Amino acid sequence: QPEPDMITIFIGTWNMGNAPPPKKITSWFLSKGQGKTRDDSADYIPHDIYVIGTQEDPLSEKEWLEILKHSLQEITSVTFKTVAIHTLWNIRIVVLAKPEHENRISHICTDNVKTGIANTLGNKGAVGVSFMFNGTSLGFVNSHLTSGSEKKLRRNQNYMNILRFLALGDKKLSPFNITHRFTHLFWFGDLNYRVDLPTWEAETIIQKIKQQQYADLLSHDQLLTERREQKVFLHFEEEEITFAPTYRFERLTRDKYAYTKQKATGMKYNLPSWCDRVLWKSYPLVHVVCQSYGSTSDIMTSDHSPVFATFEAGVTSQFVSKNGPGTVDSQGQIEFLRCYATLKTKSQTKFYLEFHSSCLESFVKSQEGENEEGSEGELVVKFGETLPKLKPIISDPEYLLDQHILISIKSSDSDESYGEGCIALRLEATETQLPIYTPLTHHGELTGHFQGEIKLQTSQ
Ligand SMILES: O=C(C1CC1)N1CCN(c2ccc(F)cc2)CC1
C-alpha cells in the first residue's frame, strides 16, 4: 500500500456562543453553505485529517468528541481516530484522522497560550497541536483574540504573543517560532477583526450583505487592512472571502444581524464582521491549495456561523537509504555562495548563521560574517564563500529536492536570533549556482533579508 504524496485537511472554526450545538452539524464537515463550497460528488470521500477549533465551547471534551466522531461516521462510514484534543478555558482544538494514518502520525505536541494581563488575562488565548505525518510536519493553531471594534492593535499584540510563546513542533529548532517550525501551519479561530465602518452605516451594511455585495465591506475588514500594512500575519495566506459576515447573528435564524449596543454587549456595537477565519503558511514551493472556504447556513445555535476551509497539502515519505538515517551520504552537499544578510538593526555586534534542517544530522553554525554599512543606513553582513558545506543524510534527489533549510542569523555577543527564514531545495537545476532568497523575521515581524546563491549536489 503506497505512502501518499498528497492529503486533504479540513479546518473548522466555530464560536459556539456558550450554547450546545444542534443535533445535525454535517453541513460544516461537508463544506456546504455560502462561499467556496465543496462539490456534492465528494460528500462520501473522507478528508485525511479534520482539525476542529471551537471558542466559547460549553461542552466537555467527551461530549464534543462523541458529536464529532458520530458526525464524521454518518458522512463517511469511517470511525476516525483521535490524534489530540486540548482545551484552554472554553477554547478547544480536536484533531481526528483516518485510521489508516495512525502509524503515519507521530511526535504529537499540544500547548496553549493565555493572552493579556490581570483584567485581560482569563478567557482569550490560543490552543495548538503539532505532529509529523510521515516526513511532513503539520501545525495547527486555534486562537480566540481580543473582542471589540476599537481593539485591533490588542488583537495584533495577542497574535505576536501566541506565535512567540506557543511551544509546538521540534524543540531542537530553538531559534524558530511556530511560523518556521512546520511544513504547513494552519492558524484559525475567532480572530475578532471587524469591518471598520461607522455605526450609523449598520443598515447600509446589512443591505449590502442581502445583495451579496461584499467588496465595499471587505475593503474595511481590519484583518485584510492590517495584513496589507504588514502589522499581523506576515507571510500567511487566506483564500478570498465570498461568504457573508459570520457575526453577529440573532440565534435560531440567520435572517437577522444583531448589531445594536445592549447591556449584554457592554454597550458596544457589533457591526456585521468576518470574525471567524482560516489562514495558512507553508514552506516555499510546497503544494498547498485551498479547495473550500465558506460558512454554514443551517447551524444557528450561536451568534456566529461555523467556518470551514479545506486544503490539498503536499506530504513526503519517511525516507530510508543504505546510508542515512544514522550517517551522511557523501554523494550529497549544499553550498551557499556570495551570501549576505541585510538587517534593520542598529546593533554593531558580529553575527553568525545557524542552518537547521531534518536533512542534517544536527544544525550547523557558520563563522562570523563581515559587517559593512549599506547606502540607505542598514547593516549588511557578508558571508562571501566562507559558509560551511552542508552534508545531508540522504543524497537521493527524490528526497533532497523536497527539503528546506531554516536559517537563523544570531548575535555573537548574545547568541540571540535577529532573524529567521527558510530556503527551499526545490531548485531548477543541480550542480548549478542558483539565486536564493528569504525574508528574515523575528517574533513574526520583518527584520531583514538573506540572499545569495546555492549549489546543490545530489546522487543524480
Ligand atoms: O502515548 C503514546 C506512546 C508513544 C508514547 N502515543 C499516544 C498517541 N498515539 C497516536 C498516534 C496516531 C494517531 F492517529 C492517534 C494516536 C500513539 C502514541
- Cβ atoms of 130 and 138 closer than 8 Å: yes
Nearest CA to ligand 1 atom 18: 106
* 248 prior amide bond cis, ω within 30: yes
Q: Which atom of ligand 1 is nearest to the CA of 108?
A: 8
Nearest CA to ligand 1 atom 15: 83
What is residue 339's three-state secondary structure? Answer: strand
Enumerate the β-bridge partners of residue 335: 455
Q: What is the C-alpha separation between 408 and 412, in angstroms, rounded? A: 12
252's torsion region: left (phi>0), alpha (psi -120 to 50) or beta?
left
Q: What is the C-alpha separation between 136 and 339, in angstroms, rounded? A: 28
Question: Ligand 1 center to residue 192 CA distance, Å?
Answer: 34
373: cell is 554599512
Strand segments, DSSP code E, in 122-251 are: 125-133, 136-144, 184-190
Straight-line distance from the first to the last Cα atom of the chain, in angstroms, rounded to the nearest whole number:
27
- Cβ atoms of 438 and 336 closer than 8 Å: no
For 274, residues 6+ apart whose C-beta sits below 8 A from its C-beta are 193, 195, 218, 221, 223, 241, 245, 246, 247
CA–chain centroid gap for 116, Å, is 21
- Cβ atoms of 143 and 223 closer than 8 Å: no
For 112, residues 6+ apart whose C-beta sits below 8 A from its C-beta are 86, 88, 91, 125, 126, 127, 128, 166
Q: Which atom of ligand 1 is nearest to the CA of 104?
A: 12
Q: What is the C-alpha separation between 86 and 106, in angstroms, rounded? A: 17
- Cβ atoms of 96 and 131 closer than 8 Å: no
Going by the DSSP 8-state scheme, the letter that residue 208 receives in this structure is H
Question: Ligand 1 center to residue 345 CA distance, Å?
Answer: 44
**How many CA atoms, within 13 angstroms, populate the side-chain half-sphere of residue 108?**
14
Closest residue by Cα to residue 431 from 403, 395, 406, 387: 395
Closest residue by Cα to residue 68 from 26, 8, 99, 98: 26
What is residue 304's three-state secondary structure? Answer: coil
Which of 7, 108, 110, 134 maximizes ligand 1 atoms within 8 Å of its Cβ, making it the mutation to test the pocket?
Answer: 108
Q: Which atom of ligand 1 is nearest to the CA of 97?
A: 14
User: Residues 409, 413, 415, CA angle at the centre, nearest 5°?
Assistant: 45
Pocket of ligand 1 from Cβ distances under 6 Å = 81, 83, 97, 101-102, 105, 108
In the block, residue with C-alpha cell 489508516? 100
CA dihedral of residues 322, 325, 328, 334 (deg, nearest 10): 110
What is residue 128's three-state secondary structure? Answer: strand
- Cβ atoms of 399 and 358 closer than 8 Å: no
Q: Number of helices (H) and strands (E) in the chain: give both, helices first.
A: 8, 21
For 331-353, letters b (16+ CB in 10 Å) and e give: bbbbebeebbbbbbbeeebebbb
What is residue 6's three-state secondary structure? Answer: strand
- Cβ atoms of 331 and 392 closer than 8 Å: no
What is residue 175's three-state secondary structure? Answer: coil
For 321, residues 6+ apart whose C-beta sits below 8 A from its C-beta are 329, 394, 395, 396, 399
Q: What is the C-alpha separation between 330 and 325, in angstroms, rounded? A: 13
132: cell is 509529523
Q: Which atom of ligand 1 is nearest to the CA of 102?
A: 14
In the block, residue with C-alpha cell 558545506? 389
In the block, residue with C-alpha cell 453553505? 33
The count of other CB atoms within 10 Å of the CB of residue 46 is: 20
Q: Is residue 288 packed enough to be buried (19+ CB in 10 Å), middle (13-18) or exposed (0-12)? A: middle
